[PDB]
Design a protein around this nucleic acid. Structure first.
Lengths: 1126, 179, 78
DNA sequence: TTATTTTTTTT
DNA sequence: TTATTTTTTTT
């Protein structure tokens, strides 16, 4: 039925079910959020609920409350008209869970009862179910649509008429009937996808124009079944279930591909298994295709010489946007001789990598130069460029940006006469400029100091390789990340989304396998919500109520298994008593090369020892083995030997054993997930399952139906709440390949690798030195095992390993019926890693706590030291670039202002209690408040600096080493500072300014402020040094209306060269060199240009040793006179 | 069958692409014995190219499009010297050849000339003895493009001033017609 | 020359008084129409026949082929 | 030295 | 006025 909202007119929105503790926790925290800025404000709420406490039930119940609240609102806001819908999403990585969760929500709508009566009437239940929509990938979306619906759509849009549609749809309409063959399914899926693209292309093509069919009734219902997004666009539906990858790619409606990230204002957005989404988003970012810069710039240069836009009022204003760009291209092409193609002079690849600050690296060891050989009309790359690449860039991006500005400019112009103008704008502009090749990149451009952080500046990777089929021309295929998955998540919050991250490990302290919650905490501030200690305690109590292991007498046994070589040798030679030796058997019968045999032994002995202990246990029947690797037919020899050992212990212990080799995910989906449960329901023998961590993260509730006739002796209810039971013994092989890697292409894999390296550097997990070596060796083709070397030395590796162990034993813990005794066999390598666990254990699973407590029964400092070097390195290379750009005569306004801003910040806030957002890495965090020690060469290598403890003797940055407290005692400077608000004394805070800032900027600026302070009261008037000589000197000065130019530098032939440079463009001038603080008794010196002493009438230059001892009023007076002698 | 046919065609293209790619370069597998027989069953043109077979049965449309061997798409029209060539139902082939000729795709001349004009201003070939003589072939063309672009103001795009199509037709002599 | 767009046309160029006849001079047809999604720019999409099927057949003979045209109406006067 | 199995969507 | 059903191969 087309049920109207009026069915809820008598519904009592106050009649909520009794809330479980988790619902209270969620409601409380969102209430707190609303208080702290929260109305019309985003949030992010990581929820580390353990699996089996009722995570999904809680989240779906929450989502249901949001639906009821929306309906309640719409019954009353009709006084305000129909507002924009408040969309609700549920996203997760895996399709199997999106569909499962949707079905659970519908089931909940069916059977939710309050005071023992069903909460919703049938028209109500149809109403709510109408609001929910589900958005699969295109191909499956097509295959869901019945033939009648799709034929109705084809008729309604008259697309029934044209041949290609009919042939294609006929073929697809056929294959459905024999899709029972999976092979048919594969072909059908691919073909259906292409059809869905073409079809929806034609629908929305007609819909944009006047050819649009007015949708209503049966045709509307047919389309809304074909295009579920149409229900959202027209407001029929407002709850959407979709995977993360669909969510990132957006989904079609009848007009255009609506993309949810662009429109999050007020959206509520439940993300299940939130930490897994870091990888999924990353896998989306790394798919970005490279653009050949050589081709791009030469094309732009060529086409922007003559090509003109028409002058008509249709787009009068646009062409002026391009004059700067056009001029830049001519300058650029003349500089680099873009007429000539490019070549190297060839077996090694040439690659460049850079984040966009301080971590620049190149493959070739020496400097890469690029010189035009006019005798060969070709630009050659030598080894003795990076500047050329950086400029071929920025011009390219500027082109895309100017394209954006011009397109919505054209939108303004035609609005003077709705998205339908977008495509005609882009094509009109590219056609006039004849730049039609770029149309793909132009479209993708729309979709793809200050707080500095990697997570929103990303990285840049450039590869130079010969074009296909040539030996004389190379391209520059630049690849980019503008952001990192944590940057995307923070942007989603800043656009106002409310995100709930339900995941048992949502706050794992890793930055590879989770978002960077240090960054998110910093950027979001108090929008990153968190569970108060009260709430965590309450959730812990509830968890104990649901899974009270202790009071019902469940015993958790943990043993750590070493390699036991003699044990393996005995069993192996029993498997082959006729053979020579055990290692012979590994080589001969098992196929293990002796290069691998030591490793395979250390592995297999632990596995077999765990198995034997399982078989000996009386009560246990269900052991799950989690290996890194799949024991399948490609390791069938090992399977046979393991089967032999199982048989031996089966006979010896007089218990039957069933072995499931090869339990990988496709086996689970296609063949045999259930009969492990069946075998538990029907037989007395024990079951051993061999599987992997990967094949269980994506996998069902690994449980079985209790057959009390077989197992009722060993099972207990552990809950105080169909009888089901779960895994009773687990073997946990140490997780191995923990670095992420992308299979999409070699380019995307490289982006994944560099993202991981830079993210580890971002946290201070790696010092900048280690991060550069790792980045470099990635350019030079690091082997995957040496990348794993580099990663294993971090502590982030420890946290990622503990994440997998915590998730593994959580997944096995769902049911509330347990054995008396649970056996946990852990690889001995995990003993130390688990021993290091130190987080608050209040939300852990009971199994994990057992693992930790058994292991223990036998780094912020490091992090802080590395971040000190990173902040110092970033300050030092950024100041070098900035100062060089000031000498890049003339200085831009922005550089000038940023220089004064840095100086003002350092003067006002030499220390701060919290690292400020806007100047986050002028400062470094000290282990000692107010001052710290460092050692390093400020002209030297930034990677070599060492700090607080590791340099007990070295330089010190402190209030005392800048003589500030001496300085402010002067009766002239102190009013000046206190008017300016500069800190006359350093607050003893943790965050202190970095050494490069201290030596280069702060002392210099402090001296300049002091000299201006004293001299101003003697009528010296100071003005900003003109932009044609900026910071070549400190201040241009006017005393008492004396007309000749005056110049200050504050603390000989080169300095004479600056002097001559000044007097070339302001004529004869007076130069004053003064140290603000020092010994005022020393003599004033009157100097020539070459700093040689001469008469005051000849002295263009004066050197003053000290103004402050006490004011050196004397030196002021002879300075006044020395000007008088002009 | 319909889906299988289309899919098999695309696979055959990609596959033979990779075979003859390797065969052109030093990566070429030396064909002999069972591998040769297997390829010659996959690529029947290989029997002709290496002289195993010399009688070919094929439709006119295949004959016009040529057929692959292990190295390149041999096209029979280019190599007819001494070929004997039985055509059955010869008069029907007029239509079939015509249907092949009419498939020729149009080239946008405005885009083509503006692209040529733009790129042939500065762009130079390298002077090395690898291809010493070539660049002199282009000086007349380059000069013509500059003359042409100046004559017709190719900087400016083109427009009419719109409901009727504008079409021109000409054989290349005396039967010129315009819409 | 940075003319990489033309690579398709360059490849197809290899494959595709005096005695005057249509059959080997062919025809030329040019259509001028607005580019997709614009109202201010037109293209000139030229189409060509260099020859006619009788011209192709005569070229095949001139390259030395020996052709047997078995057909019950091989010399229909059309 | 370290030692694998994995998802999703679109062209 | 004239008044339909058709093949083949490749991208």
């Amino acid at each position: 039925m087309n049920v109207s909202i009026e069915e809820f007119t008598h519904f009592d929105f106050q009649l909520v079910p009794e809330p479980s503790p988790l619902d209270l926790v969620i409601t409380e925290s969102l209430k707190n959020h609303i208080e702290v800025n929260g109305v019309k404000s985003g949030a992010l709420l990581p929820l580390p609920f353990q699996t089996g406490i009722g995570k999904t039930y809680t989240a779906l119940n929450f989502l249901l409350q949001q639906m009821l609240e929306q309906v309640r609102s719409e019954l009353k806001e009709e006084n305000t008209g129909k507002k924009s819908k408040r969309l609700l999403y549920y996203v997760t990585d895996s399709v199997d869970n999106v569909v499962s969760a949707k079905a659970d929500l519908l089931k909940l709508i069916e059977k939710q009862t309050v005071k023992g009566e069903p909460r919703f009437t049938l028209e109500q239940q149809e109403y709510l179910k109408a609001q929910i929509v589900h958005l699969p990938n295109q191909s499956e979306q097509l295959l869901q649509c019945s033939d009648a619906v799709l034929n109705d759509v084809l008729i309604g849009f008259n697309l029934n008429a044209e041949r290609d549609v009919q042939a294609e749809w006929s073929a697809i309409s056929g294959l459905r009937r024999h899709a029972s063959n999976p092979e048919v399914k594969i072909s059908l899926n691919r073909q259906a996808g292409y059809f869905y693209r073409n079809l929806i292309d034609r629908l929305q093509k007609k819909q944009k124009g006047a050819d649009r069919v007015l949708l209503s009734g049966s045709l509307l219902a047919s389309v809304e079944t074909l295009l579920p997004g149409e229900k959202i666009r027209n407001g029929s539906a407002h709850v959407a279930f979709l995977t993360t990858s669909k969510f990132l790619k957006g989904f079609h409606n009848t007009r255009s591909r609506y993309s949810p990230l662009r429109d999050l204002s007020g959206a509520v957005l439940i993300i299940d298994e939130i930490d897994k989404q870091n990888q999924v988003i990353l896998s989306e970012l790394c798919k970005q295709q490279a653009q050949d810069l050589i081709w791009a710039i030469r094309t732009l240069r060529a086409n922007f010489r003559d090509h003109q836009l028409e002058s008509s009022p249709r787009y009068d204003k646009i062409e002026d946007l391009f004059e700067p760009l056009r001029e830049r291209l001519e300058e650029f092409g003349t500089n680099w001789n873009l007429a000539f193609a490019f070549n190297t002079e060839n077996e090694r690849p040439v690659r460049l990598f850079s984040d966009r600050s301080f971590t620049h690296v190149s493959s070739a060891t020496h400097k890469l130069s690029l010189k035009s050989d006019f005798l060969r009309r070709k630009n050659l790359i030598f080894s003795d460029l990076t500047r050329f690449v950086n400029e071929a860039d920025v011009i390219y991006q500027w082109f895309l940006g100017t394209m954006r500005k011009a397109v919505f400019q054209y939108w303004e112009n035609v609005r003077g006469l709705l998205e339908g103008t977008f495509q005609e704008a882009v094509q009109s502009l590219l056609t006039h400029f004849n730049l039609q090749e770029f149309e793909s990149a132009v479209y993708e451009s729309f979709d793809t100091s200050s707080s500095k952080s990697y997570h929103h500046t990303g990285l840049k990777l450039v590869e130079v390789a010969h074009n296909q089929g040539t030996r004389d021309t190379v391209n520059c295929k630049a690849s980019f990340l503008n952001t990192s998955p944590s940057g995307v998540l923070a942007d989603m919050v800043d656009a106002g989304a409310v995100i709930l991250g339900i995941s048992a490990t949502a706050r794992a302290d890793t930055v590879i396998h989770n978002f960077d919650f240090k960054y998110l905490n910093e950027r979001l501030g108090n929008k990153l919500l968190s569970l108060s200690r009260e709430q965590k305690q309450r959730v812990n109590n509830y968890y104990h109520s649901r899974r009270n292991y202790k009071d019902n007498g469940v015993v958790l046994t943990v043993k750590y298994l070493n390699s036991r070589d003699a044990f393996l040798d005995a069993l192996l030679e029993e498997y082959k008593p006729e053979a020579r030796s055990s290692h012979f058997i590994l080589n001969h019968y098992l196929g293990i090369a002796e290069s691998e045999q030591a490793f395979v032994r250390s592995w297999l002995s632990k596995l077999l020892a765990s198995i034997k202990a399982f078989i000996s246990s009386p009560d246990n029947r269900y052991m799950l083995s989690l290996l890194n690797r799949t024991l399948d037919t490609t390791r069938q020899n090992i399977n046979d030997f393991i089967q032999f050992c199982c048989d031996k212990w089966a006979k010896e212990f007089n218990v039957k054993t069933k072995t499931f080799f090869g339990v990988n995910a496709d086996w689970m989906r296609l063949v045999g997930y259930d009969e492990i449960s069946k075998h538990l329901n029907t037989e007395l023998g024990k079951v051993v399952v061999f599987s992997t961590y990967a094949s269980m993260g994506a996998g069902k509730n690994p449980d079985y139906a209790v057959n009390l006739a077989l197992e009722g002796e060993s099972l207990i209810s552990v809950a105080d709440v169909q009888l089901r039971s779960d895994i009773d013994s687990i073997y946990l092989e140490k997780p191995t390949q923990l670095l992420l890697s992308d299979d999409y292409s070699h380019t995307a894999n490289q982006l994944c690798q560099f993202h991981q390296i830079l993210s580890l550097q971002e946290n201070g997990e790696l010092s900048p030195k280690s991060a550069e070596n790792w980045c470099r060796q990635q350019l030079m083709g690091m082997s995957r095992e040496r990348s794993l070397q580099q990663y294993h030395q971090t502590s982030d590796y420890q946290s990622a390993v503990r994440k997998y162990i915590e998730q593994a034993v959580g997944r096995a813990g769902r049911t509330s019926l347990k054995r008396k005794q649970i056996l946990l066999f852990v690889d001995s390598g995990l003993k130390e890693i688990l021993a290091e666990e130190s987080r608050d254990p209040s939300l852990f699973s009971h199994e994990y706590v057992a693992l930790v407590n058994k292991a223990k029964s036998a780094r912020a400092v490091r992090r802080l030291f590395n971040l000190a070097q990173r902040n110092n390195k970033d300050g030092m290379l950024s100041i070098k670039a900035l100062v060089h750009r000031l000498h890049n005569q003339p200085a831009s306004k922005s550089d000038i202002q940023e220089w004064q801003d840095i100086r003002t910040q350092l003067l006002r806030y030499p220390t701060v209690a919290f690292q400020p957002e806007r100047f986050n890495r002028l400062y470094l965090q000290s282990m000692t408040k107010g001052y710290y020690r460092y050692q390093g060469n400020l002209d030297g290598d930034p990677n070599s600096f060492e700090f607080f403890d590791r340099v007990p003797y070295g330089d010190m940055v402190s209030e005392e080493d800048c003589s500030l407290a001496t300085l402010v005692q002067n009766q002239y400077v102190r009013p000046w500072f206190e008017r300016k608000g500069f800190a006359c004394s350093w607050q003893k805070e943790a965050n202190v300014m970095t050494p490069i800032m201290f030596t280069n900027i702060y002392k210099g600026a402090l001296g300049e402020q002091a000299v201006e302070a004293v001299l101003t009261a003697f009528d010296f008037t100071f003005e900003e040094v003109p932009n044609s000589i900026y910071e070549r000197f400190d201040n241009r000065v006017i005393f008492a209306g004396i007309e000749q130019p005056i110049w200050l530098d504050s603390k000989s032939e080169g300095y004479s060269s600056k002097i001559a440079l000044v007097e070339e463009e302001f004529g004869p001038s007076k130069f004053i060199y003064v140290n603000a603080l020092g010994d005022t008794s020393k003599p004033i010196r009157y100097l020539n240009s070459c700093f040689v002493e001469t008469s005051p009438q000849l002295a263009k230059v004066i050197e003053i040793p000290a103004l402050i001892d006490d004011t050196n009023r004397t030196a002021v007076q002879e300075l006044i006179k020395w000007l008088h002698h002009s």
